[PDB]
Symmetry: C3
Subunit: 206 residues, 3 copies
Amino acid sequence: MNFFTSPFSGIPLDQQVTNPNIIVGKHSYYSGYYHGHSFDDCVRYLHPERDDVDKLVIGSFCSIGSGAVFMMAGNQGHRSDWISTFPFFYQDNDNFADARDGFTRSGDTIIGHDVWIGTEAMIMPGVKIGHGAIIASRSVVTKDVAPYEVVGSNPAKHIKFRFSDVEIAMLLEMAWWNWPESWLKESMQSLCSSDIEGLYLNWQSK
Amino acid sequence: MNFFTSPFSGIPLDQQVTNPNIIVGKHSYYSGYYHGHSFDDCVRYLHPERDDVDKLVIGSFCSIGSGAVFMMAGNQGHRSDWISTFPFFYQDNDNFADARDGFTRSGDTIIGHDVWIGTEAMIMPGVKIGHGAIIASRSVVTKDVAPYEVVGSNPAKHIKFRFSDVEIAMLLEMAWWNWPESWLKESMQSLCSSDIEGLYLNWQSKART
Amino acid sequence: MNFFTSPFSGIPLDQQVTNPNIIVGKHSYYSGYYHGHSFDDCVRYLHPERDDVDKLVIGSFCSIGSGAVFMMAGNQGHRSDWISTFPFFYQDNDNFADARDGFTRSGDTIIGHDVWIGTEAMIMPGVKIGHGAIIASRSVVTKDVAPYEVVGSNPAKHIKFRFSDVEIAMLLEMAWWNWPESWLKESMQSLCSSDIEGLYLNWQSKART
Ligand SMILES: [Cl-]
Ligand SMILES: [Cl-]
């Protein structure tokens, strides 16, 4: 009936991602009890058979909320710049035999490290989301998001940056997500804190 | 249960619609794999047997994405201009005996030809969407949309027009969705192009004589 | 296995809430045929066993549309002011021992009386909504809403006040939702009307000193 056993269940991406065209880092998870399905069906219209289509890549340590949507397959065959958006080429009717293929790639959808995707946000094809970003709930993300940026609304718009500029530089330098597991245990208390200038030296001195 | 067998499955509306108050043109289709239900349950609160309610009318060659919503039954009995929006008339309670019917109709929801309605868009009661319009995904459409206009956001607002004013007028005179099917089969390459000028000249030489 | 019988079936909240941390007033009803589930699953991430968590309080005579969402559990353990939004504390992996709890409560979500919550609206944690308010369909409510204020969009913003300042203060003072049943029953016509001042003057004469 329901993939998730409880509303607070958070199952890792790699544990449930079966689509070969979906690339997830470890520890990233999706908690979708309230929509009933595994992460595969958050990723819409991604052919598992082909290697010419746009791919979805998600980094490590991401948190994805229930009913988030990753729209793939570009324009789905609709060319708004042609006379008609109706996709003749893909409809079965002999009257449509001379139709042209309106499908166009958008590029891959790139989801960086440590990014928080709010429940029921929708990510449009070919969006790039930088490290440490926050997509508010119900956002409709139509443009790239810069690292540690917070966006929300429909369409998604700049709300704020999580940290100061020199602080974002510091975090993208050490890139804590790339560290070995034995190392993470030790800086955990600094990670669960605001002391950005602080942890910048424990990585630097070592 | 999923009505559709694959995400790319798109069934013509006239194959799945059962509600006598839903009127759909040829070739229009709904691809609702990701919301499970067939197109009927896209049309919310439409009494299927009464003949005195707002109807949903959809033209031909329309593309409707998954979980699109068409809100019917007007204000559903809720009067914001009355002291309370609670619909006393429609709740079973002997103390609500002298309530008044707050139900108000909005008029038909009319979607024209060659309209693209994005996934999970919500159309409010009484909205008219003209030919060739595009409703971005997740739009909440609260007022009418002109021909060949693109709108999005919540509430939906103008994004752009697909073509120049002259070209829009040209397309509406041609009304290719109404052409004989032989003309449509012959024009299929032009229709999958931006060449309005050429196709309009080709139509005139066929239809002006 | 839908919980509601027809699209028009609105079931009183007090007849379908099991979470001890959801408290509902009389006559308030949820109308959720098009999302299938009972009202409990509208209220998300609300621990039902604990009493140190944010609670949901809903006045009487509220109308709640299908698939409305009430976000509880505050920030869910994600602290945007910490270096990482990833909730180490709640991740069960062995590496994450010296993790710290990032959960922060938002305070109770409070819905006054006579509130109309449009379908598929989402109320954020800790939000208070005053009596007589209207939340438009698909609203994302991030801020408090005043009595008899109409809001909508994502995030929700002021649209209008339903009535004048005088009329609103009259309504908050007379508090018709708290009236004995017999007063409610005999005022049913006035309530299905816009004559606040007239009702106010009657309420004064029946209730003063
Ligand atoms: Cl929205
Ligand atoms: Cl939605």
